């Protein structure tokens, strides 16, 4: 269960890192020199942070999905592992399946 | 000045330049420098029309392909009357096709002698980039 | 210099080079080296125009196909007047088609003598890759 | 060297090779080995241009179809002037069509003598494959 | 060797094979076995080019349609100069059309003498199939 | 053997078969059985090429339409040189069109004498069918 | 046997049948019954090829349109050489068009003498129909 939780947490952290801006790919026509290639690459690299930009009509930039999903699978795995650990360590009556409130003699 | 009188003579021989440039003497005797200069200037103006959107205008160096194109256009301009099927007209059309291909980003402007040309900053422009909270605070 | 005077002589025989290069003597007697050099330079400039976007300009080696293309274009350039149905013009058009196919990534630039050419880094560019949390911490 | 002088003689008879190769003697007397070598080299360069993206360049063996294609292209290259309706030009065009079909993955490069050619690793590439948790732990 | 000299003689008569194969004697006297062998080899190489992607190369048996195609292509190859409107060229084109139809899976390679040819395992490939929990446990 | 020498004689008269089959005697005197056999075999091979994907190869009976098609193709094969506008060529093309229509499932192979031909099991294949819980338990 | 010798004589006159059927006597004297029988059989085979998918093969009765089509095809088959612009060829093409229209379900096979033809059960097939709980229980 520890390894399962570790893998789930690391994967969730990576997916949160990728989340945000989309991946966008620039295309250039034949006869584009290396300096123009570097300029296009820097423009694409900074385009996500930069609201606006201009390119020649002969070029093209396509915004592709980056990472679309949810945290539901990761969190489900973490909860499963944590419940397993709680049951194994302290029993499945008070920690994992908590006994809830309720007083009395 | 992407081409000179020497380039025209070398490409088309001095006899043809004399024949198409001397308009006052029959038979021709000398090459009129003013007419050749005007033809070369017109060729350069057309080439700049084609190249203004991708490179700086006052080029500090002349690429070799630019020299060939300028020579061809200048020779085509030295003809007072130029019909459609004249081979010189066809050569001018091919050179104009090369220029259009360069303008539309299908051909690259080659080396001048050893270094690259100077492209304009048209593609460089981006807004600026606002990325606070990502500067290792 | 993808081709030399020796290559032109070998491909088209010395007689034809003499005939199309000697413009001052009738009948021709010698091959004008300056005219041949200019024609070869123009062919190289056109080829560089076609190849600038995929390979480095100052190639350290000349691929054989490049030699054939340069020889053909140089010979076509040595004709002051070239009509549409002239077979040399058709050969030049076929070679230009080969060059365009190379530029559009449909043909590859072959071996020079034993090693590959040097493609440019146009396709290499990627942002950088941010993958913290995945470095075996 | 996908074809040799022996192959050219066998395919087109020694008389025709002598006639199209001897440029200095009229009538022809001997076959010029240098001209034939250059023509064969040019044919090989074109074929490599067509085949560079699917197979290794320095082929250790020559497939038979490659021999026929090289012979045809070499013979077509031995003509200083080649018109459009010349049947040799049509044969060269058909062979170029075969080469293009091979390049576009519509035709396969046949056996050399008994074994297959050596395709390049272009299609092999995949990322690597991350499949932890599936290794019988 | 999908066809032999006997097949060529039977299909086109010995006189025509002698006429198109003897290049050194005028009038022809004997059939040159080397030239016929090379033509047949070239026809086989083209056919293998067309059939490599669907069947094994070193076929242990020769289907009859393959014999007819090889004979036609070999005869077409024995002509040094072959024009477009020559009927032999048209027959070669029809046979090439048959080969292309076979390659594109529109025609099947027929019986050799009594058994089927040997198709390649190109279509066989599937991953493997993971179906645990379905093995009558 | 979808057709025999008797069928060819009946369809095209014995004189024409003699004329197109006897290649060594001028004028013709006898019908060469070997040449006719090879032509019929080639016609059968082409027909099998067309019919392999829908019926079994070694047909136990010959449908009448198959006899007509085989006779036409065999006669067309007995011509060493066959031009495009020759009516026999047009008849062969029509018969090939009929064969292609049969292959593409637009025409059915007719009765042989009283019973149907034997189609292949290509369409029969289905997985197997898992329908437990539906067997009247 | 959708048509007989009497039908051919009635449709095309006995003289024309004699002329196109007697191949051994010049001028013709008698009608060869074997040749006419083979031509009629070939016409019937083609018609069955066209009609196999919609009706039973061994038709017990011959529709009148079928008689006309068979007569036309049989007469067209009695010509050893038939050019494209021959009117008999055009009539055969029109009849084949009628047959194709019948096959594609655009024309119906008419009455034989008073009753309908016998269509095949191709359209009849349905699974079976499971409709328990709807049988007035």
Cβ atoms of B69 and B98 closer than 8 Å: yes
For A76, counting Cβ atoms within 10 Å of its Cβ (0-12 exposed, 13-18 middle, 19+ buried), the class is exposed
Query: Kindly report the CA angle at C65 between C63 and C66, in degrees rounded to 5?
Result: 65
Chain C touched by A14 (CB under 8 Å): yes
Provide the residue count of chain F.
Answer: 137
Cα dihedral G87/G93/G96/G102 (nearest 10): -100
Q: Rounded to an integer, what is the distance from CA A31 to the centroid of its chain?
A: 37
Buried b (16+ CB within 10 A) or exposed e, D28-62: beebbeebbebbbbbbbbbbbbbbbebbeeebeeb
Chain F touched by G6 (CB under 8 Å): no
Q: Rounded to an integer, what is the distance from CA E82 to the centroid of its chain?
A: 20
The full DSSP string for E54-102 is TB-SS-SS--HHHHHHHHHHHHHHT-SS--TT-HHHHHHHHHHHHHHHH
Distances in Å between the Cα of G120 and the Cα atoms of C136, D62, F114, F121, G52 are 73, 59, 17, 21, 9
CA distance E24 to chain F (A): 24
Backbone φ and ψ of E62, nearest 5°: -110, 110
3-state secondary structure of D129: coil
CA distance F7 to chain G (A): 9
Cβ atoms of C129 and A10 closer than 8 Å: no
Buried b (16+ CB within 10 A) or exposed e, G34-45: ebbebbbbbbbb
Residues of chain D positioned with their CB less than 8 A from the CB of C119: none
CA distance A33 to chain C (A): 5
Cβ atoms of G101 and G66 closer than 8 Å: no
Cross-chain Cβ contact E64/F82 below 8 Å: no
3-state secondary structure of C126: coil
Tokens of G44: 């019937």
Question: Which residue's structure tokens are 């008999």?
Answer: G88
- Which residue from E85, E91, E83, E105 is spatially nearest to E11, judged by alpha carbons? E91
Q: What is the rounded distance in angstroms from the CA atom of residue G68 to the CA atom of residue G10?
A: 11
Cβ atoms of G43 and F64 closer than 8 Å: no
Q: Which of F42, F53, F81 sits opposite E68 (nearest CB)?
A: F42
Resolution in angstroms comes to 3.1
Q: What is the rounded distance in angstroms from the CA atom of residue E45 to the CA atom of residue E70?
A: 10
3-state secondary structure of B63: coil
Compute and round to an integer the Cα radius of gyration of chain F.
20
Cβ atoms of G63 and G111 closer than 8 Å: yes
Q: What is the rounded distance in angstroms from the CA atom of residue B70 to the CA atom of residue F101?
A: 61
On the question of a cis peptide bond just before residue B27, with omega within 30 degrees of 0, the verdict is yes
Judging contact as 3 or more Cβ pairs under 8 Å, the answer for F and E is: yes
Tokens of G33: 């019954």
User: After which residues does chain E break, using C–N > 2.5 Å?
Assistant: none
- Residues in CB range of C40: below 8 A, 6 or more apart: C1, C2, C3, C4, C8, C70, C74
Tokens of F65: 């339409």
Cβ atoms of F109 and F55 closer than 8 Å: yes
Distances in Å between the Cα of G135 and the Cα atoms of B92, F136, G43, G130, G131 are 90, 19, 53, 11, 8
Q: What is the rounded distance in angstroms from the CA atom of residue G20 to the CA atom of residue G38?
A: 13
Reported as type and span, the H/E element at residue E126 is none
A residues 51..80 contacting B (CB < 8 A)? 51-56, 58-59
3-state SS, one letter per residue, for chain G: CCCCHHHHHHHHHHHHHHHHHCCCCCCCCCCCHHHHHHHHHHHHHHHHHHHCCCECCCCCCCCHHHHHHHHHHHHHHCCCCCCCCCHHHHHHHHHHHHHHHHHCCCCCCCCCCCCCCCECCCCCCCCCCCCCCCCCC
3-state secondary structure of C70: helix
Residues of chain E positioned with their CB less than 8 A from the CB of F45: 63-65, 67-68, 110
Cβ atoms of F58 and E114 closer than 8 Å: yes
Residues of chain A positioned with their CB less than 8 A from the CB of C52: 31, 33
Provide the residue count of chain B.
Answer: 137
Backbone φ and ψ of D15, nearest 5°: -65, -45
3-state secondary structure of C56: coil
Backbone φ and ψ of D82, nearest 5°: -130, 115
CA distance C47 to chain A (A): 12
- Residues in CB range of G81: below 8 A, 6 or more apart: F87, F88
Cross-chain Cβ contact F80/E16 below 8 Å: yes
Cβ atoms of F103 and F53 closer than 8 Å: yes
Q: Which of D35, D44, D50 sits opposite C107 (nearest CB)?
A: D50
Residues of chain C positioned with their CB less than 8 A from the CB of A37: 120-122, 125
Assign 3-state DSSP to chain F and report helix, strand, coil percentages, each to 5.
50, 0, 50
3-state secondary structure of A26: strand
């Amino acid at each position: 269960p520890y390894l399962f939780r570790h893998y789930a947490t690391s994967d969730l952290a990576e997916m949160l890192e990728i989340y945000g801006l989309p991946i966008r790919l620039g295309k250039y026509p034949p006869g584009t020199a290396d300096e123009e290639k570097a300029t296009l690459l820097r423009a694409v690299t900074g385009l996500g942070h930069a609201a606006a930009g201009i390119i020649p009509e002969t070029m093209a930039i396509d915004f592709q999905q980056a990472a679309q999903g949810s945290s539901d699978p990761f969190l489900a795995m973490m909860r499963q592992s944590e419940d397993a650990i709680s049951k194994a360590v302290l029993g499945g009556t008070l920690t994992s399946t908590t006994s809830q409130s309720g007083g009395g003699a | 000045s992407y081409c000179t009188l020497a380039d025209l003579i070398e490409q088309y021989s001095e006899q043809k330049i004399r024949e198409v440039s001397d308009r006052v003497n029959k038979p021709a005797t000398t090459i009129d420098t003013v007419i050749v200069d005007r033809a070369i200037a017109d060729a350069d103006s057309e080439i700049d029309l084609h190249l203004h959107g991708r490179y700086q205008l006052p080029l500090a160096s002349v690429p070799t392909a630019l020299k060939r194109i300028a020579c061809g256009l200048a020779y085509a301009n030295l003809h007072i009357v130029l019909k459609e099927e004249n081979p010189v007209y066809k050569t001018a059309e091919h050179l104009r096709k090369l220029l259009s291909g360069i303008a539309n980003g299908k051909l690259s402007l080659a080396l001048d002698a050893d270094g690259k040309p100077a492209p304009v900053a048209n593609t460089v422009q981006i807004s600026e980039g606002r990325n606070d909270w990502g500067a290792d605070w």
